UniProtKB/Swiss-Prot annotation, chain C:
The 26S proteasome is involved in the ATP-dependent degradation of ubiquitinated proteins. The regulatory (or ATPase) complex confers ATP dependency and substrate specificity to the 26S complex. This is 26S proteasome subunit RPT4. The chain holds residues 176 to 437 of 437 of the full protein. GO terms for cellular component: nucleus; proteasome complex; proteasome regulatory particle, base subcomplex. It comes from Saccharomyces cerevisiae (strain ATCC 204508 / S288c) (Baker's yeast). The keyword Nucleotide-binding applies.
UniProtKB/Swiss-Prot annotation, chain D:
Belongs to the AAA ATPase family. ATP binds at G41, P42, P43, G44, T45, G46, K47, T48. It is found in: Cytoplasm; Nucleus. It comes from Saccharomyces cerevisiae (strain ATCC 204508 / S288c). This is 26S proteasome regulatory subunit 6B homolog. N-acetylated by NAT3. The 26S proteasome is involved in the ATP-dependent degradation of ubiquitinated proteins. The regulatory (or ATPase) complex confers ATP dependency and substrate specificity to the 26S complex.
UniProtKB/Swiss-Prot annotation, chain G:
The keyword Acetylation applies. It comes from Saccharomyces cerevisiae (strain ATCC 204508 / S288c). One of its GO terms (biological process) is proteasome-mediated ubiquitin-dependent protein catabolic process. The modification N-acetylserine is found at S2. Present with 16800 molecules/cell in log phase SD medium. Belongs to the proteasome subunit S9 family. This is 26S proteasome regulatory subunit RPN6. One of its GO terms (molecular function) is structural molecule activity. N-acetylated by NAT1. Component of the lid subcomplex of the 26S proteasome, a multiprotein complex involved in the ATP-dependent degradation of ubiquitinated proteins. In the complex, RPN6 is required for proteasome assembly. Keywords: Acetylation, Proteasome. GO terms for cellular component: proteasome complex; proteasome regulatory particle, lid subcomplex; proteasome storage granule. The keyword Phosphoprotein does not apply. Component of the lid subcomplex of the 19S proteasome regulatory particle complex (also named PA700 complex). The 26S proteasome consists of a 20S proteasome core and two 19S regulatory subunits.
UniProtKB/Swiss-Prot annotation, chain H:
Belongs to the peptidase T1A family. Present with 7060 molecules/cell in log phase SD medium. It comes from Saccharomyces cerevisiae (strain ATCC 204508 / S288c) (Baker's yeast). InterPro entries: Ntn_hydrolases_N, Proteasome_alpha, Proteasome_alpha-type, Proteasome_asu_N, Proteasome_sua/b. This is Proteasome subunit alpha type-2. It is found in: Cytoplasm; Nucleus. It holds the Pfam family Proteasome. There is a cross-link at K108 (Glycyl lysine isopeptide (Lys-Gly) (interchain with G-Cter in ubiquitin)).
């Protein structure tokens, strides 16, 4: 169906700065929301929304990505449980990057309101986000 | 306390009016009449139940004409139906005096709409227990209206009333789906008599008489007249052939 | 099993109301302990008749599978000497034995009202019947695994004391479905009905005025007899609108309750 | 755990918990203590909150019997169960 | 009752309940017009049930306002009247 | 004795039964309508419900145009609506003839309220079963909305509502004004206030409307017009694309 | 610009940059400028709507006269503002009159300057027919005579208010009269009039609605009268319910009011010879929070003095904390 | 057609009273609670604005109307019955005085004309009595400040201070000890605020309270200068910001 | 009945102080409670 072409969506966006990552991925966002909304527990593929994490990571600062997480938390995000999967994706590249991005990692935790706002606790990973901040204060 | 149904202006605790509901019941006790709206005009049809052989054929006019292009047909009490036409004739005559050119179809509905409603506001007079179906060719396109005892009306692409109102209105939905783009005025004449015979199953215990009057700009050119000659007999054999 | 979650469709907005007061506390009771809220015991079902309020009782019995007890209003009114007060204590006696139990109530217009005592030709049996239903959900006896589902045709005929919190915590209203909710109902009753391959139910949506979930079933039932006279196995879609127009003239009585209904 | 009833709670504790502890206070002031306490007001709100607090605070004999519980399927059993309480 | 009697209820029930620091109980006390003690108990329970539908845990300020107008009127519209002015 | 509930008189409970029964007759059609005040204008949206295919959607309208600067929206039975519509146009045109200029919105709601009381205080006539809601933009207060009633008491609202779900519409719209602490919508363009009211109307009513399921009136400064089926459908497409 | 917001924000910055005395002349320049509607004030310019911003400007500087030493000059500043408000509408007259007195009495100042200002404000009510304004100032004036420790001027105003408030008006304000009267006889070592005035205050407490600060002061002074007959078990309930009232006020009241309540609660438990209940309050963080001092820790050694039963340990902290505990 | 009811809807009860008026006072005692007080320097009237809907605009509603520039009015009853009565009260005031005597009628002569309309509805058939009670207060150049209480029965009585509404039992008793022989215009305002505040079950502010006072003739509110005869109307209504000024003054 | 109510409530306030006598403090509190019941409803 429409999920087979997800790899061919953006050819140029990998090489260039890709300022259209917000606008171009919007066409793949609002369309898949109407087929799921809050009804089905798991319907749409949650890896499509996680592609935004793989778009701009090392080539762009972490402040622009945190601003997109605020809009996804207020909106549906193609699934009500889509936020459950996005939490494990944000914590994947933090340990694989390091370098000079360790100073910006402190501001990412305080900027994201998902780990700050209480929920039904679908994942243990978001509870360890504040645990990593404790280890930073120890150093 | 009892008495909600004694007077007119008294409102029921459920939000209805008994004098209005009982007036609608008197509509289904009379002779049935239908109508068909076309692109260039409208077509009226009525089935008059013949009591005995003493009735002289075609001497009873069921469809009364107001001004020229405005036809009127009613199903219900005879004096209540003739009073609306006689009142509507004075409204069309008083309009042309000051306003020159004749009143259109959608504007004429406001004359009877406020007149019938004035009877339900006062207990001195009673509403009309007859359903009047009026229409014709106005200045722009055409319109058709059916006056209810409550005074409520809208634009009707088709109209059904009387004893056979249940089976006649069901056939009007088939005519709309048959010709969704448009319907000629000559074809609707034969289709009007066909629906009457399909609704005659309830009235089949007595004798019937077919009376059809149509108005459009294709032939009469803004004139509302009855059907005479071989045109009336042609619609009878065409409608009875499918039976 | 007969009626399922697919046949109750169109109520989806009101279906999640029961899942929170039934499916949620039974599957994971610890959620209410984390926030600190008390699990709701009684649930009130009111609205116009024919909207599927009874079907909500049959749909849960064919899915959850827990032991349920149907308690009609007129089944416990048997009177010898103080009999109706004893029968009520018999139904709640099985709550402590079998923990996953939910006792229903079927269309109570009588013993749910207030009706204090002046004259009334020795109503003490029904008067004490009201006192028993207000006992088990009040006194120090603690259950928490027993839910009370009470259905009625109108809240005004129920005791205002019973409507107070502490007995019925959440009142789930089942009004008439909207224009988007009616269309799903036509496909439920016509799913097992043989007809032509070309079908449009959007016509009966506008034709439906003030109809309920039950009256839509009568439209498909009456349409079946229209094809019998013409010797047709498949129902003509044009004959479907004939029955809908016929049902519209069947009511003639009330059909609208607004200001005095919660 | 229940606030706002301190106005009506003080009157009950003096007419229930107080005479059960010291019965000589009423004999000195010359006031006959009421043999019980009723409750009024709109149903379905209170009357179960203050009684439950007294049973937990007093930690003594407490008898809870429904009003219609005294009715028994047998004629003479009804009045016999009333005196037994 | 008035705001003086109800302020000892909301604050007492919310002790065991899980609320948020941004939510203020005094905001609803002004909005409370002549209520009873049982209706308040239904407000705190309905506010917790809405957090499950919204996938929340603590009770926010929006959960108390959205669950207010639903449980405040127990009869018809407003005090079984419409408007008198 | 038992006639206290029939004609309007002081009741032993100090109320008026016929006035209370009149509110139950306004919802007979069961149509929800809401109106929000834009910055430079005011927009109103009402449900368009056509029960039968024989009714022409273009002819069926629940929104009447009193004057170029004054719109009117009525929730209730059409016969009592058209009776008050033809009467309101007579009193509105009388002001321009007698007083020389155009009547504002607050005065027209004031004169019809005192006229609706004549239908009440007088025992030989009955009150109107409709609620007249006038939408107009004056030259002083600008955008304003005044809602009448069969009791004859007119009062201004920020966002007016009606229908059986009015309690759900008023509560849903209340959270917008209390959070933003604004008395009117800050959108300058009249197209933005149309799409803004549709979003809160769908979520409150829980229904996805179609092109023929709504009638959207638009009252601008010194101009009033009603959007057709093509303009209403165009706004619904832009909402699904943007949101 | 001529906007009022630009004048206030620019003056607030000058306080932190250099001093508030330089910004005081800016507010003096608002008397002959910044016109408004209605009528004028001092005759130089028209000030009506802009008086509220000029009143706040005095409120901001009102707490800053302690460092400058203008307390003696503040005596004639308040009554002169009343004559300036007689030109335009009198709706703003009570605002400037009542609000300044609340702030003027809040900052520490000599008792002579506080009484003389309230006496001049009543003079405006003497020339006029003012009733509630004169009665509202009489309660605040008699309160100032209470801190003077003079029963002649204190009882002179109270006896005049009893023959008025009882037979005329001010039902809720009558509670403050019995509360203040009970305090006067409390310093005179008279338990007959002090307990009688407290009973009359509790009679009108449930009859007329009272705010939080009024009810909190009733139970606070009530438990003090229960120290003569001992029975500290029932007297502790007065200070326990009082502490919940002052703690909920937070910044709305003074911190010294709630800090003293902790001193009476700890003293009532020591009289009951309960060591564990004293340590449970001190160990609880929510009972202290931002309230701490040497007088609070002074009673901690007193509880430990009776726990170990040592007089030398009590006399050691007795003279050292005498400046606080005693 | 016309009207077929010529008979009086108000009949004498066997107990010696009228059933329509006996039930008319019930509708007055249940509803908005207003009040009023008269002083030596003016008359102070006040009323509370109830909120039927949270989106209702209080500025579009005038609870205190204007009969003559020197005379105000306040009503505790139903809205519609007040407007038609006042609209007919201004007509009989201009026709019988402005078009005859040329000046405005005083307080004593105006209350007789206003009560004349209500007393005719209690007798003539086809109509029902008015279920509202109006307080007519004003000032003239001879009799001075006077306040009259118009009952639904058609009879009027002078009152120094009175209150009508749900709290009419408690408020009227309080005004007995709150009134004396010497009062100012501003002093009577605080009396009206202390009495009305206890009757407010909703939000307490200047938008929900309509406070109108009759002071000295104001040349600024007149609209023209140069004529010493007319110094401006004595009737004045405090705005939302002006009412909030004296609310914190208590 | 109001006079007997003051006499009945006279001993109620004496139980709070745990004393066997009734002084002027109880009569002042008893009258204030009875006068509020008559003015209520």
């Amino acid at each position: 169906k429409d999920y087979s072409q997800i790899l061919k969506e953006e050819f140029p966006k990998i090489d260039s700065l890709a300022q259209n990552d917000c606008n171009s991925a919007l066409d793949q966002l609002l369309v898949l929301e109407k087929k799921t909304r809050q009804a089905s527990d798991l319907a749409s593929s949650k890896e499509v929304l996680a592609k935004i994490v793989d778009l701009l990571a090392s080539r762009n600062k972490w402040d622009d990505l945190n601003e997109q997480l605020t809009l996804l938390s207020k909106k549906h995000g193609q699934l009500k449980l889509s936020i459950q999967y996005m939490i494990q994706k944000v914590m994947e590249y933090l340990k694989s990057s390091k370098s000079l991005d360790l100073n910006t990692r402190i501001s990412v935790i305080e900027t994201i309101r998902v780990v700050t706002e209480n929920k039904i606790f679908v994942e243990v990973e978001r509870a360890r986000v504040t645990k990593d901040l404790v280890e930073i204060k120890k150093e | 306390g009892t008495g909600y149904d004694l007077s007119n202006s008294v409102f029921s605790p459920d939000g209805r009016n008994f004098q209005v509901e009982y007036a609608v019941k008197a509509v289904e006790n009379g002779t049935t009449s239908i109508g068909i709206k076309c692109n260039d005009g409208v077509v009226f049809a009525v089935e008059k139940l013949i009591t005995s052989k003493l009735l002289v054929p075609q001497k009873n006019v069921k469809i009364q004409v107001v001004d020229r292009h405005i036809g009127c047909v009613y199903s219900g009490l005879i004096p209540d139906g003739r009073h609306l036409v006689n009142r509507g004739r004075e409204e069309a005559a008083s309009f042309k005096k000051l306003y020159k050119t004749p009143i259109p179809i959608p504007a004429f509905a406001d004359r009877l709409g406020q007149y019938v409603q004035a009877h339900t506001l006062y207990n001195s007079v009673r509403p009309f227990g007859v359903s009047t179906i009026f229409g014709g060719v106005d200045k722009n396109g055409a319109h058709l209206y059916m006056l209810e005892p409550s005074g409520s009306y809208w634009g009707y692409k088709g109209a059904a009333t009387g004893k056979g109102r249940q089976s006649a209105k069901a056939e009007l939905e088939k005519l709309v789906d048959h010709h969704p783009e448009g319907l000629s005025a000559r074809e609707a004449v034969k289709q009007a008599a066909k629906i009457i015979y399909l609704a005659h199953e309830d009235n089949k215990e007595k004798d019937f008489e077919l009376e059809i009057s149509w108005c459009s700009l294709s032939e009469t050119n803004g004139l509302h007249k009855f059907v005479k000659g071989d045109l009336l007999q042609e619609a009878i054999d065409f409608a009875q052939k499918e039976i | 099993g007969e009626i399922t979650f697919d046949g109750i469709g169109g109520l989806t907005e009101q279906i999640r109301e029961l899942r929170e007061v039934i499916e949620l506390p039974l599957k994971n009771p610890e959620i209410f302990q984390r926030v600190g809220i008390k699990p709701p015991k009684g649930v009130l079902l009111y609205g116009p008749p024919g909207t599927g309020k009874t079907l909500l009782a049959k749909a849960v019995a064919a899915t959850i599978g827990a032991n349920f007890i149907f308690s009609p209003a007129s089944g416990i009114v048997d009177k010898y000497i103080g009999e109706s007060a004893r029968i009520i204590r018999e139904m709640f006696a099985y709550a402590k034995e079998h923990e996953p139990c939910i006792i229903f109530m079927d269309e109570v217009d009588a013993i749910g009202g207030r009706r204090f005592s002046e004259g009334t030709s020795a109503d003490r049996e029904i008067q004490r019947t009201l006192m028993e239903l207000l006992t088990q959900m009040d006194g120090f006896d603690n259950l928490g695994q027993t839910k009370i589902i009470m259905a009625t045709n109108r809240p005004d005929t129920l005791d205002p004391a019973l409507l107070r919190p502490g007995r019925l915590d959440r009142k789930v209203e089942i009004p008439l479905p909207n224009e988007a909710g009616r269309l799903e109902i036509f496909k439920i009753h016509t799913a097992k009905v043989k007809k032509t391959g070309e079908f449009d139910f959007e016509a009966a949506v506008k034709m439906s005025d003030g109809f309920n979930g039950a009256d839509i079933r009568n439209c498909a039932t009456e349409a079946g007899f229209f094809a019998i006279r013409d010797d047709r196995d498949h129902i003509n879609p044009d004959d479907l609108m004939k029955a809908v127009r016929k049902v519209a003239e069947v009511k003639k009585l009330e059909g609208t309750i607004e200001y005095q209904k919660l | 755990d229940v606030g706002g009833l301190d106005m009506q709670k003080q009157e009950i504790r003096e007419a229930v918990e107080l005479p059960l502890v010291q019965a000589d206070l009423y004999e000195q002031i010359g006031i006959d203590p009421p043999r019980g306490v009723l409750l009024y007001g709109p149903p379905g709100t209170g009357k179960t909150m203050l009684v439950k607090a007294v049973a937990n605070s007093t930690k003594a004999a407490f008898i809870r019997v429904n009003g219609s519980e005294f009715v028994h399927k047998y004629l003479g059993e009804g009045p016999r169960m009333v005196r037994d309480v | 009752r008035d705001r003086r009697e109800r302020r000892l209820i909301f604050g007492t029930i919310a002790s065991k309940m899980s609320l948020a620091p941004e939510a203020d109980l005094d905001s609803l006390i002004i909005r409370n017009d002549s209520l009873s003690g049982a209706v308040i108990a239904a407000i705190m329970q309905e506010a917790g049930l809405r957090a499950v539908r919204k996938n929340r845990y603590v009770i926010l300020q929006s959960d108390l306002e959205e669950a207010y107008a639903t449980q405040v009127k127990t009869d018809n519209t407003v005090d079984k009247f419409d408007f008198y002015k | 004795a038992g006639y206290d509930r029939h004609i309007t008189i002081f009741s032993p409970e100090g109320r008026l039964y016929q006035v209370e029964y009149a509110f139950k007759a306004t919802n007979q059609t069961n149509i929800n309508s809401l109106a929000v005040r834009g910055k430079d204008c005011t927009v109103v949206i009402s449900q368009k419900k056509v029960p039968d295919k024989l009714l022409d959607p273009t002819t069926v309208s629940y929104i009447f145009c009193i004057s170029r600067t004054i719109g009117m929206v009525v929730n209730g039975p059409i016969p009592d609506a058209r009776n008050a519509a033809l009467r309101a146009k007579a009193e509105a045109a009388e002001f321009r003839y007698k007083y020389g200029y155009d009547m504002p919105c607050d005065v027209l709601a004031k004169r019809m309220a005192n006229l609706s009381q004549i239908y009440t205080q007088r025992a030989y006539m009955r009150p109107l079963g409709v609620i007249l809601t006038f939408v107009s933009v004056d030259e002083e207060l600008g955008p304003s909305i005044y809602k009448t009633d069969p009791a004859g008491y007119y009062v201004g609202y920020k966002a007016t509502a009606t229908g059986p779900k009015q309690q759900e519409i008023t509560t849903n719209l209340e959270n917008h004004f209390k959070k933003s602490k604004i008395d009117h919508i800050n959108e300058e363009s009249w197209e933005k206030v149309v799409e803004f009211a549709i979003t809160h109307m769908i979520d409150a009513l829980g229904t996805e409307f179609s092109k023929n399921d709504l009638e959207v009136g638009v009252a601008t400064k010194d101009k009033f017009f009603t959007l057709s089926a093509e303009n209403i459908e165009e706004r619904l497409v832009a909402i699904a694309e943007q949101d | 610009m001529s906007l009022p917001g630009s004048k206030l924000e620019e003056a607030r910055r000058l306080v932190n940059e250099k001093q508030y005395n330089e910004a005081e002349q800016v507010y003096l320049s608002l008397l002959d400028k910044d016109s408004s509607q209605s009528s004028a004030a001092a005759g130089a310019s028209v000030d009506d709507k802009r008086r509220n911003e000029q009143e706040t400007s005095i409120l901001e500087l009102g707490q800053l006269y302690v460092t400058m030493g203008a307390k003696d000059k503040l005596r004639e500043f308040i009554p002169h503002s009343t004559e300036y408000m007689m030109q335009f509408a009198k709706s703003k007259t009570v605002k400037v009159l009542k609000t300044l007195i609340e702030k003027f009495e809040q900052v520490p100042d000599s008792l002579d300057d506080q009484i003389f200002v309230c006496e001049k404000s009543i003079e405006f009510a003497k020339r006029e027919k003012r009733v509630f304004l004169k009665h509202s100032l009489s309660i605040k004036l008699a309160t100032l005579h209470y801190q003077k420790k003079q029963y002649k001027d204190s009882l002179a105003l109270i006896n005049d208010l009893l023959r008025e408030f009882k037979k005329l008006d001010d039902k809720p304000s009558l509670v403050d009269v019995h509360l203040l009267e009970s305090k006067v006889y409390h310093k005179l070592r008279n338990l007959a009039k002090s307990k009688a005035s407290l009973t009359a205050a509790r009679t009108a407490a449930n009859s007329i609605y009272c705010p939080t600060q009024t009810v909190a002061e009733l139970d606070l002074m009530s438990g003090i009268l229960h120290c003569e007959d001992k029975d500290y078990k029932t007297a502790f309930s007065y200070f326990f319910e009082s502490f919940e009232s002052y703690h909920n006020l937070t910044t709305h009241n003074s911190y010294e009011k709630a800090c003293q309540v902790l001193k009476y609660m700890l003293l009532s438990k020591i009289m009951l010879n309960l060591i564990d209940d004293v340590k449970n309050i001190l160990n609880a963080k929510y009972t202290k929070e931002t309230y701490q001092s040497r007088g609070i820790d002074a009673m901690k050694a007193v509880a430990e003095a009776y726990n170990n039963r040592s007089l030398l340990d009590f006399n050691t902290a007795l003279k050292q904390y005498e400046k606080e505990l005693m | 057609m016309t009207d077929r009811y010529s008979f009086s809807l108000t009949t004498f009860s066997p107990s010696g009273k009228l059933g329509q008026i006996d039930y008319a006072l019930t509708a007055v005692k249940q509803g908005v609670t207003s009040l009023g007080i008269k002083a030596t320097n003016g008359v102070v009237i006040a009323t509370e604005k109830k909120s039927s809907s949270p989106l209702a605009m209080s500025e579009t509603l005038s609870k205190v109307s204007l009969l003559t520039p020197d005379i105000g009015a306040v009503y505790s009853g139903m809205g519609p019955d007040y407007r038609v009565l006042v609209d007919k009260s201004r007509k009989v005031a201009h026709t019988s005085y402005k078009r005859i005597y040329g000046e405005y009628p005083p307080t004593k002569l105006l209350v007789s004309e206003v009560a004349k309309i209500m007393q005719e509805a209690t007798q003539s058939g086809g109509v029902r009595p008015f279920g509202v009670s109006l307080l007519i207060a004003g000032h003239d150049e001879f009799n001075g400040f006077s306040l009259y209480q118009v009952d639904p029965s058609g009879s009027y009585f002078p009152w120094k201070a009175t209150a009508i509404g749900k709290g009419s039992v408690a408020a009227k008793t309080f005004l007995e000890k709150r009134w004396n022989d010497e009062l100012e215009l501003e002093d009577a305002i605080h009396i009206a605020l202390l009495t009305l505040k206890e009757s407010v079950e909703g939000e307490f502010n200047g938008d929900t309270i309509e406070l109108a006072i009759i002071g000295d003739e104001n040349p600024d509110l007149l609209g023209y200068t140069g004529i010493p005869t007319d110094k401006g109307p004595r009737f004045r209504k405090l705005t939302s910001q002006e009412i909030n000024d004296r609310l914190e003054a208590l | 009945a109001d006079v007997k109510g003051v006499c009945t409530e006279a001993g109620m306030y004496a139980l709070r102080e745990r004393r066997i006598h009734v002084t002027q403090e109880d009569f002042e509190l008893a009258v204030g409670k009875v006068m509020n019941k008559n003015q209520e409803t």
